[PDB]
Design an enzyme around this catalytic site. Structure first.
Site, short mmCIF file in Angstrom:
data_model
loop_
_atom_site.label_atom_id
_atom_site.label_comp_id
_atom_site.label_asym_id
_atom_site.label_seq_id
_atom_site.Cartn_x
_atom_site.Cartn_y
_atom_site.Cartn_z
N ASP A 25 0.49 -9.47 -3.75
CA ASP A 25 1.61 -8.61 -4.10
C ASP A 25 2.92 -9.14 -3.52
O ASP A 25 3.30 -8.86 -2.38
CB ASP A 25 1.31 -7.20 -3.59
CG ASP A 25 2.28 -6.16 -4.00
OD1 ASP A 25 3.34 -6.55 -4.55
OD2 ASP A 25 2.05 -4.96 -3.75
N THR A 26 3.62 -9.95 -4.32
CA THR A 26 4.84 -10.59 -3.82
C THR A 26 5.96 -9.61 -3.60
O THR A 26 6.90 -9.93 -2.88
CB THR A 26 5.32 -11.69 -4.75
OG1 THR A 26 5.50 -11.19 -6.07
CG2 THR A 26 4.31 -12.86 -4.79
N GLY A 27 5.89 -8.39 -4.17
CA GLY A 27 6.83 -7.34 -3.91
C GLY A 27 6.56 -6.52 -2.68
O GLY A 27 7.33 -5.57 -2.41
C1 LIG Z 1 1.83 -0.87 -4.44
C2 LIG Z 1 1.66 -1.77 -5.68
C3 LIG Z 1 0.23 -1.72 -6.22
C4 LIG Z 1 2.59 -1.34 -6.83
N1 LIG Z 1 4.04 -1.44 -6.51
C5 LIG Z 1 4.59 -2.81 -6.48
C6 LIG Z 1 4.77 -3.27 -5.04
O1 LIG Z 1 5.04 -4.67 -5.03
C7 LIG Z 1 5.91 -2.53 -4.28
C8 LIG Z 1 7.30 -2.85 -4.75
C9 LIG Z 1 8.35 -2.13 -3.97
C10 LIG Z 1 9.22 -2.80 -3.11
C11 LIG Z 1 10.16 -2.12 -2.36
C12 LIG Z 1 10.24 -0.75 -2.44
C13 LIG Z 1 9.42 -0.08 -3.29
C14 LIG Z 1 8.48 -0.75 -4.04
N2 LIG Z 1 5.79 -2.89 -2.84
C15 LIG Z 1 5.39 -2.05 -1.92
O2 LIG Z 1 5.05 -0.92 -2.03
O3 LIG Z 1 5.38 -2.68 -0.70
C16 LIG Z 1 5.22 -1.86 0.48
C17 LIG Z 1 4.41 -2.70 1.45
O4 LIG Z 1 5.37 -3.62 2.00
C18 LIG Z 1 6.63 -2.98 2.06
O5 LIG Z 1 7.62 -3.82 1.52
C19 LIG Z 1 8.15 -3.26 0.27
C20 LIG Z 1 7.79 -1.79 0.33
C21 LIG Z 1 6.58 -1.73 1.21
S1 LIG Z 1 4.97 -0.24 -7.10
O6 LIG Z 1 6.31 -0.57 -6.74
O7 LIG Z 1 4.43 0.97 -6.62
C22 LIG Z 1 4.88 -0.19 -8.82
C23 LIG Z 1 3.96 0.53 -9.45
C24 LIG Z 1 3.92 0.45 -10.93
C25 LIG Z 1 4.81 -0.49 -11.57
N3 LIG Z 1 4.78 -0.58 -12.94
C26 LIG Z 1 5.79 -1.07 -10.93
C27 LIG Z 1 5.81 -1.02 -9.54
#
Ligand SMILES: CC(C)CN(C[C@@H](O)[C@H](Cc1ccccc1)NC(=O)O[C@H]1CO[C@H]2OCC[C@H]21)S(=O)(=O)c1ccc(N)cc1
Lengths: 99, 99
Positions: A25-27
Site C-alpha cells: 500500500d504505497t498510500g
Molecule cells: C486502507 C486501504 C486498504 C485503503 N485506502 C488507501 C490507503 O492507501 C490510504 C490512503 C490515505 C492516505 C492519507 C490519508 C487518508 C488515506 N492510506 C492509509 O490509510 O494509510 C494509513 C496508514 O499509514 C498512514 O499514512 C496515511 C494514512 C495512514 S483508503 O484511502 O481507505 C481508500 C479506500 C477506497 C478507495 N477507493 C480509495 C482509497
C-alpha cells in the site's frame, strides 16, 4: 518481483512467527495489521485514514518477511479493514513505483 | 520513471482542467479526489478505510492526466483528506510495483 495493478497487490508475509496476507500500500505511511498478538512492549497510538481516526498498538523494531524479503520496523495493530504494508517497510525491501 | 517511497509518492495530475497533487496509491482500488464541483452525472457510493467510511460521488469516464500520461475512467469525489490515484488509473498509465 514486478507487480502489476489490475488486481490488488496482495502478498504473503511472515511476522511473530505466523503467515498472513497483506496489501502492498504505497498510500500508507505506516504498516497496519488486524488484531493479532505480538511479543514485547507496545505503546498506544492513534492514526488517521480516509474515514477518521483509530487506536492502535505500536510495536517497534519488529521483523517482517514480505515475499521473501526481510524488513524490521514498526507495526501498528488495530482495526484496519485489511492488513496493509506501508512505506516504512516497503522502503526496506527496496520497493519502488515504475511507469 | 521511478518513484521512490522514502516520501509520499505525490505527483501532479490534471482533471476537469485543474492541476492537482495526488498520491500514487496501490492500496486504493479506485481514484478518490478531494471535493470539487465536476460537471456531469454521478452515482452515490460509500468507500471504507481506516476509521470507517466516507460518502463520495462516482463519476465515470473522466479524463485525468498523471505526469503527462493520459487516463480516463472513474473518479470518486468526496471529503477525502488527500487526492488518491487508485489502481483503476494506475494501470492505464503503466504503473507497477517493483522490488
Ligand atoms: C486502507 C486501504 C486498504 C485503503 N485506502 C488507501 C490507503 O492507501 C490510504 C490512503 C490515505 C492516505 C492519507 C490519508 C487518508 C488515506 N492510506 C492509509 O490509510 O494509510 C494509513 C496508514 O499509514 C498512514 O499514512 C496515511 C494514512 C495512514 S483508503 O484511502 O481507505 C481508500 C479506500 C477506497 C478507495 N477507493 C480509495 C482509497
Amino acid at each position: 518481483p514486478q507487480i502489476t495493478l489490475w488486481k490488488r497487490p496482495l502478498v504473503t508475509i511472515r511476522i511473530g512467527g505466523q503467515l498472513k496476507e497483506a496489501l502492498l500500500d504505497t498510500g500508507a505511511d505506516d504498516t497496519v495489521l488486524e488484531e493479532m498478538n505480538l511479543p514485547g512492549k507496545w505503546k498506544p497510538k492513534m492514526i488517521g485514514g480516509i474515514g477518521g481516526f483509530i487506536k492502535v498498538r505500536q510495536y517497534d523494531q519488529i521483523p517482517v518477511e514480505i515475499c521473501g524479503h526481510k524488513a524490521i520496523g514498526t507495526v501498528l495493530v488495530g482495526p484496519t479493514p485489511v492488513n496493509i504494508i506501508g512505506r516504512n517497510l516497503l522502503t526496506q525491501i527496496g520497493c519502488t513505483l515504475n511507469f
